[PDB]
């Protein structure tokens, strides 16, 4: 009943940008000071994974 559109989830971009900028520094402690790290989306396989 009513209009249809896909289900979705909203995450504020400023908070997520800050959270990534805070996790990247904790990750550099194990993988190098003044180095670059990347993260793309999932590889593939199970839908639940």
């Amino acid at each position, epitope marked *: 009943i009513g*209009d249809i*559109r896909q289900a979705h989830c909203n995450v504020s971009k400023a908070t997520w940008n800050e959270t990534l900028g805070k996790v990247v520094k904790q990750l550099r402690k194990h993988f190098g000071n003044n180095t670059i790290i990347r993260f793309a989306n999932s590889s593939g396989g199970d839908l639940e994974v």
Partner: antibody
Amino acid sequence: QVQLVQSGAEVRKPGSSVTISCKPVGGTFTNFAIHWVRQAPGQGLEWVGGRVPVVGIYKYGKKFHDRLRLYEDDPMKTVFLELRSLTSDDTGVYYCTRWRGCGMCPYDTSSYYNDASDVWGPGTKVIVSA
Amino acid sequence: EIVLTQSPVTLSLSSGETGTLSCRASQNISSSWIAWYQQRRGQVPRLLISAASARAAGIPDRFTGRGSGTDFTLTITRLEPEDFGVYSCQYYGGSFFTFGPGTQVDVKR
């Protein structure tokens, strides 16, 4: 781009009731509100009522209480106007009006009612004459 | 209630001539609840300007809208024989919409 398609003209006896359909084509159904603007033959435009289709946000004119009833039918995606106790004053052309906006933005689940009307139905000529 | 009035009942204009229609409100209203409509020869009304200044989709440059508080004006710098007919102003703010009585324009002669 959206479009409004109404019913054909009708003739009703005084004191009876009339029901007019209006089906939008190619647009969001539950967002913007459907207002009804009528024009008595030779006079200015008169606002009848307005109603968000499914949400129910509606309000009729002061002149049309105990005679007007706006409803809809989402299986057919068509709104309806019902006017009772017809007099020769109620003769005229009834318009189905609506606002259209953005179109690309789909995540808007809200309901709007205080808007103008750029999308107009061709009109439905209601003639009250016994 | 909120009722609107239109002053220049019949406004005569030739080609290139400039006119100014008025729409006075009873109370003080916001400058975001006034629209202007064009109605040519008993056909479908076309929304000219929303929010008393926002020119609608495809409406030409010849239609400029102004107004604040009580009086709202619609200025037509130039006009073709295309845009002739009855102009109406609508208050679309509160829970009760109300239109202006209409104002017809003539080919000045």
